Amino acid sequence: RNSAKDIRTEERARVQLGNVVTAAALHGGIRISDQTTNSVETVVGKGESRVLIGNEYGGKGFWDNHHHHHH
């Protein structure tokens, strides 16, 4: 149960509602966990900000991950 109330995407901003199926976590099996409910009131995304409403399923790269620089 992933629900949002008020979202405002401005300046090349995008918004997705549902779930994230990544090739790293097999195909779109659908319905695996759903142990916790997710609800958000107001989301503000400006300046190419990406709004993602829904649990993800991957592993190799958490949506946005490509760091190889060791500190």
Segment 17 to 46, residues that bind its own copies, using CB under 8 A: 17-46
HEC secondary structure over 18-50: CCEECHHHCCCCCCCCCCCCEEEEEEEEECCCE
Tell me how far, at minimum, the Cβ of 33 lies from its own copies, in Å. 4
Shortest distance in whole angstroms from residue 71 CB to its own copies = 7
Near its own copies in 41-70, by CB under 8 A:
41-70
Contacts of 37 (CB under 8 A, 6+ apart): 1, 2
Residue 27: CB minimum distance to its own copies, A: 7
